[PDB]
Design an enzyme around this catalytic site. Structure first.
Site, short mmCIF file in Angstrom:
data_model
loop_
_atom_site.label_atom_id
_atom_site.label_comp_id
_atom_site.label_asym_id
_atom_site.label_seq_id
_atom_site.Cartn_x
_atom_site.Cartn_y
_atom_site.Cartn_z
N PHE A 163 8.33 1.99 -1.12
CA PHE A 163 9.47 2.29 -0.25
C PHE A 163 10.13 3.66 -0.43
O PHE A 163 11.20 3.90 0.13
CB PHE A 163 10.55 1.21 -0.40
CG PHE A 163 10.13 -0.14 0.09
CD1 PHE A 163 9.88 -0.37 1.44
CD2 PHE A 163 9.98 -1.20 -0.81
CE1 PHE A 163 9.49 -1.62 1.90
CE2 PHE A 163 9.58 -2.46 -0.36
CZ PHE A 163 9.34 -2.67 1.00
N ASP A 211 0.83 -1.20 0.00
CA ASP A 211 0.00 0.00 0.00
C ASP A 211 0.87 1.26 0.00
O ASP A 211 2.00 1.23 0.48
CB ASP A 211 -0.87 -0.03 1.27
CG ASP A 211 -2.24 0.58 1.07
OD1 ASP A 211 -2.92 0.23 0.10
OD2 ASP A 211 -2.64 1.41 1.91
#
Length: 223
Positions: A77, A64
């Site tokens: 990330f 997500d």
């Protein structure tokens, strides 16, 4: 769709007309009318804007998008300045500091430099309601990202898939281990990093593999 790289649209536009996608865009459009949705529209497909689909060499699967102000911007990330690298990214940089000899912490958590080199930082779900994690799950994004993962699986050769954590390993469970290289380990998150991510040396391994097949390695320090 706008803000969607042409080279990618040329091969993935077929998804835009399918019912699941059409319903998806309507749900997202309705959400934005009532609440704040991340990332903003021009950054939902940042992963298609950093490089030509033909230059994809590495795939890192995420779940997500970050749900905080100015955090998410299309890549898993990654966070935009001046947002500091989240716990998971600091552990990623930590592994890199021991795995890649010339890697240097850039201070920021913006991974655009990797996306530019052919590192697909793909989340499974591409939008999320402000401050509500997983709010847009099971609405259509997974079918799309699975469609993308599948296209790359059947159409590319020698890609390196980095599967960190349970969610990613499950989504990447269909990748042809013969046609592609699949490296798996624990999620870099503090809660599981000590189970194997530290020491996985996936970045040096990815380059050794890419290079062996005559492909350009990833210069991880180039951020």
């Amino acid at each position: 769709m706008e803000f969607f790289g042409e080279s990618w649209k040329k091969h993935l536009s077929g998804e835009f007309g399918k019912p699941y996608f059409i319903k998806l865009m309507g749900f997202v459009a309705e959400e934005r009318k009532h609440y704040t949705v991340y990332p903003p529209p021009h950054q939902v497909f940042t992963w298609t804007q950093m490089c030509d689909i033909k230059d994809v060499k590495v795939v890192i699967l995420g779940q997500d998008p970050y749900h905080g102000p100015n955090q998410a911007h299309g890549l898993c990330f990654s966070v935009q300045r001046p947002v500091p690298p989240p716990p998971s990214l600091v552990n990623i940089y930590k592994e890199l500091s021991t795995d890649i000899e010339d890697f240097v912490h850039p201070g920021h958590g913006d991974l655009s430099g990797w996306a530019k080199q052919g590192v697909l930082l793909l989340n499974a779900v591409l939008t999320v309601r402000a401050h509500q994690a997983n709010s847009h799950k099971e609405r259509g994004w997974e079918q799309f990202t699975d469609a993308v993962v599948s296209w790359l699986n059947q159409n590319s050769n020698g890609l390196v898939f980095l599967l960190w954590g349970s969610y990613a390993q499950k989504k990447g469970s269909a990748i042809d281990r013969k046609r592609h290289h699949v490296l798996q380990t624990a999620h870099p998150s503090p809660l599981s990093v000590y189970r194997g991510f530290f020491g996985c040396r996936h970045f040096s391994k990815t380059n050794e593999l890419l290079q062996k097949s005559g492909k350009k390695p990833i210069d991880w320090k180039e951020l």
